[PDB]
Amino acid sequence: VLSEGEWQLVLHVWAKVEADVAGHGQDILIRLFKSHPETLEKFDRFKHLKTEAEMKASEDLKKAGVTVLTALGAILKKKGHHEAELKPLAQSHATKHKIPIKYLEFISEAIIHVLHSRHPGNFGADAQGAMNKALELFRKDIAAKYKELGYQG
């Protein structure tokens, strides 16, 4: 359970993300795909992209990134009261996309990497720790839902 102060660190850096969600989503998904190429294979629509340049020019990839961060933002803004939001997301990611928890770990790592790079004004050690705690809570609650749904994750 996060403190209100931890949530405010999370939401203060999230506010900067929201200045340009598309740009942040491109940097985050590209970092994920570069750092863990096997994750790109889950995306039928742009799994053929070969290079970072191709990835940056992909309007579909950009839209995916917006979709991810907007859904994650809505979850973060619930400050742990995210049961309703997590239901559909868990279901799709368990049953349709087949995203293992290990891959949610990799995207959390990519998020933290990009925020650290872009937002040193709002992402010092305390803020990074709060964001890690928020992402760990997300993964914990998603993992519990996966088990309910029948997916070993």
Ligand code: HEM
């Ligand atoms: C913070 C973590 C994540 C969030 C909040 C998120 C959110 C979303 C949302 C909102 C959608 C659209 C609706 C849906 O299908 O549920 C989506 C689609 C998808 N997500 Fe995620 N996602 C996350 C992580 C991942 C990861 C790590 C992968 C793969 C390694 C993944 C693979 C997919 C795929 C394959 C689709 C379908 C995209 C398409 O139609 O081309 N997601 N995700």
Ligand SMILES: O=N[O-]
């Ligand atoms: O009270 N701030 O963790």
Ligand SMILES: O=N[O-]
């Ligand atoms: O895309 N960052 O390595």
Ligand SMILES: O=N[O-]
């Ligand atoms: O496509 N924005 O959630």
Ligand SMILES: O=N[O-]
């Ligand atoms: O706690 N949300 O499943």
Ligand SMILES: O=N[O-]
């Ligand atoms: O409650 N969403 O399946």
Ligand SMILES: O=N[O-]
């Ligand atoms: O649960 N929808 O893919």
Ligand SMILES: O=N[O-]
């Ligand atoms: O993308 N992780 O450093």
